[PDB]
Structure formats: structure tokens, C-alpha cells
Amino acid sequence: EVQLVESGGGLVQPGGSLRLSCAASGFTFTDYTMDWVRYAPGKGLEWVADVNPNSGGSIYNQRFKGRFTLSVDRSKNTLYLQMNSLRAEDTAVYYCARNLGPSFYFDYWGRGTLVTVSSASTKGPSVFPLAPCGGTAALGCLVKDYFPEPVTVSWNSGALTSGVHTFPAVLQSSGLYSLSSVVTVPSSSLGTQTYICNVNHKPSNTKVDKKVEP
Amino acid sequence: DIQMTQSPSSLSASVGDRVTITCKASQDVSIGVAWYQRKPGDAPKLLIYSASYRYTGVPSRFSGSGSGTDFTLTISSLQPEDFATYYCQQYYIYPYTFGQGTKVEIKRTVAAPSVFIFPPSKEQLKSGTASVVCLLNNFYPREAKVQWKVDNALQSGNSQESVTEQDSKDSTYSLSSTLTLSKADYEKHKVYACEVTHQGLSSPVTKSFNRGE
């Protein structure tokens, strides 16, 4: 199974440096070219750079030349993207990708790591239950005032997935994010089954398991 | 740099329709064009390479055609799971540029929202703030209005709404409207309500609660 695991992403102040890494597994590392591609809403997709794991030779997009350095460690099956002098314009999800030969189309992509370039500080969310005072009933969780993005929400440790609606985060006036996670369940289960939402905001290491009681 | 211009920027089509997305190159690229599918919160998936060659495991409905400067991606029979942003990419000339993308939305039958209201929690009230949430579940089309009332008085500038991406299975949208008030403002009133207007509803719907019940 081919997998490209990215790390080193997160919040960085403007003018700051970040080093992204991509652990490659499930294939012969030195047999394919490795790349970094970035995504930003409204801006679309942009090829950043490529490195040949066999030689160590790397080619950069003229916008990122000098500013970013792409190295590799064959013994560790990891490629590194040193990103220097980061600006707000650099805020994007950075993807690790694989290609073969002179054809730069990418068959395998990593999960993507979000890089947030901001002067603001890390703030964990406050987690509050959403419970009511027919056949179907709704219950949820309010994940309020956190920075930076993202947050993950699961219900009953990942057992409950159907009818789950985790709303996109809304940026508030304060510069802090806020979101809601809801779930539609049968009304008869409210008194016989326990509903717990599990919230994880990795930047602040806040892991909350809130029980929702009607 | 070679520009890759996609047309249209967005489109809507019913399940089973033939969808046609075009890509224009600023100069000749022969058949060095790839197509990708990017679903929300997911990494782009490779669909087509060499302008017409379909990648392994890609459904038969997806097909590419064209050479030189004019390229097309076709979905023979649109499915509810095909909701995504599609990108063309020229890959034989550096810096192997991608098109802006085309957001494919699914047209479906009108579906009325199931509306729910949530009072601020006891845990939140000890923090000096109060959030009242109004949920509009699984509806079509995307257009819906949510009005807030406190002690039968219309609210303005103190609510924020969030809409989920089109559901990959039933092609419906969900909305949440959060009314934010101070603990003081919440403790000085009793009736809290949200009025929902949507095409699937014959007349507006109201959900409400009385603080201290």
C-alpha cells in the first residue's frame, strides 16, 4: 500500500521558517520523482518543486526558487521542504506527490498539511453540548473560539458516522474560528444510548470528550 | 508560463446527465494533459493522463479527449458522488501548470429542511456568553433564509450561518445559524426563536424555546 505521510505543518509567524517532511512507503522510493504541490481556496493548484530521490537533484518553480530548499534522506525514505521567509500569501495545504519520468502527472498524493502564516497565537476551543429542552431527534457540539485551523470531530469514538454534519469553520470578528457538529439520531435512543462528541484541535493539544444530555 | 483556462467555472446537472468541462491551453501541448478530481477536504485524484487515457480504478463514465490547445473532460452519466472540483493540468512543460478548476454541483428534487433549535448550555452560561443554534437539516436547493427573534423582536448583526458541502449520497445541504448574545442579554429575555423560509416549505416554519424550561 502506497502512502505519503506529511508532517511539520502548522502556525508560523510572517517572516518565519517551516520545514515540511514527507515519509514515503509501499514502493521503491528511488524509482519515482517526488513533488510538492500546494492548494489554496480561490487560488487553485500550484506545483512547488520536485526532487529525484536517486540523485538528490531538485527543480523548483521560479516563484519558490531560493526561498524553498528540497532535500532527501534515502536511509529514512523522507524528503524535506525547507520554507523560509513565509508570508500570508504562503497560507495553503501543501501536498506531497509522486510522478514517473518526464511526465509530471501525479498518481499518488498525500493527505496534505496546512500551513498557516499569521501573527496570531494558538488558542484551544471551548466545547459545549447542543441538546434540546417526532421520530428523529438532533443533538450536537459547539466548538467555539479556536486558532489556527483545523479541528476534527467524531461521535461515540467513530462508531456513529451516518447523519453527522460537521459544519465548515466560520472566522469570527475576533480572528478566532468557531464551528458546530451535529447528528440526527432516532428519538427513542436519547434515554437508552449515551452520546459523546470527541473534539481534537492538534495545534493546542486540546482533546475533549463532551457527553450530550437532552 | 502556459495558462490553462477551464470553462465553465461551475455547473449544475441532474443525476444521469452528460457533463462536459473544457480546458484551453495558451500554447500547443499536444496530449500532455491530465485531469484531476478534488472532493472537499480531500487530496486531488488522478482521472485521465495523455489527454484520453483513463487511470486504473477510474469509473468508465469519466473520459478525456482533445489535442493541442483544446481539451475536454466528459462524465457520461453524472452520479451524486461526482460532486467535486475538476482540474486540467499540462505536464510536459515546466512549471506543469493546473487550470482554475470547475465546481460540479448536482441538480436534484426539492427537499424541505428539518428544523431544530438548541438553547445555550449550563456550562457555557458560566462563561458570560450564550450561543443559540438553529439547524436546517438536509434540504434542496441551497437557498434558505433564517430570521432570529428574541422576545418577539427581530435580530440583526448578531448571527452567523454556516452551510455544509453538497452531500455525496443524497445531494442535500445543511445549514446552522448561531445567535450570539452576552449572558446578561440572554438572562433578561424569555422567548428565543428562528423562522425558516425555503422553497420546499409552503409557509415559513418556526422553532422556539423559553429560557428556564
Produce the secondary structure layout:
The complex is a heterodimer of chains A (214) and B (213).
Chain A: E1 3-7, E2 10-12, E3 18-25, E4 33-40, E5 44-51, E6 58-60, E7 68-73, E8 78-83, E9 92-100, E10 103-109, E11 113-117, E12 126-130, E13 136-146, E14 152-155, E15 164-166, E16 170-171, E17 177-186, E18 195-201, E19 206-212
Parallel strand pairs in A: 2-11
Antiparallel strand pairs in A: 1-3, 3-8, 4-5, 4-9, 5-6, 7-8, 9-10, 9-11, 12-13, 13-17, 14-18, 15-17, 16-17, 18-19
Chain B: E1 4-7, E2 10-14, E3 19-25, E4 33-38, E5 45-49, E6 53-54, E7 62-67, E8 70-75, E9 84-90, E10 102-107, E11 114-118, H1 122-125, E12 129-139, E13 145-150, E14 153-154, E15 159-163, E16 173-182, H2 183-187, E17 191-197, E18 205-210
Parallel strand pairs in B: 2-10
Antiparallel strand pairs in B: 1-3, 3-8, 4-5, 4-9, 5-6, 7-8, 9-10, 11-12, 12-16, 13-14, 13-17, 15-16, 17-18
Walk me through what this model shows.
The complex is a heterodimer of chains A (214) and B (213). Chain A is mainly β and 214 residues long. Chain A has 2 domains: 1-119, no CATH class; 120-214, Immunoglobulin-like (Sandwich). Chain A is 0% helix and 55% strand. Chain A has strands spanning 3-7, 10-12, 18-25, 33-40, 44-51, 58-60, 68-73, 78-83, 92-100, 103-109, 113-117, 126-130, 136-146, 152-155, 164-166, 170-171, 177-186, 195-201, 206-212. In chain A, strands 2, 4, 5, 6, 9, 10 and 11 form a 7-stranded mixed beta sheet that branches. In chain A, a hairpin with a 4-residue loop joins strand 18 (195-201) and strand 19. The radius of gyration of chain A is 21 Å and the shape is elongated. The relative contact order of chain A is 0.17. Chain B is mainly β and 213 residues long. Chain B folds into 2 domains: 1-108, Immunoglobulin-like (Sandwich); 109-213, Sandwich (Immunoglobulin-like), CATH 2.60.40.10. Chain B has 2 helices and 18 strands. In chain B, the strands form 4 sheets. A 6-stranded mixed beta sheet of chain B has the order 2-10-9-4-5-6, with no helix packed on it. Chain B has a 4-stranded antiparallel beta sheet with strand order 1-3-8-7, with no helix packed on it. Chain B is elongated. The interface between A and B is large, with 43 and 46 residues. The PDB classes it as immune system. The entry lists the keywords bispecific antibody, computational design, heavy chain/light chain interface, CH1/Ckappa interface, PertuzumAb, immune system. It forms a dimeric assembly. The entry is titled "CH1/Clambda Fab based on Pertuzumab". Chain A: CH1/Clambda Fab heavy chain.
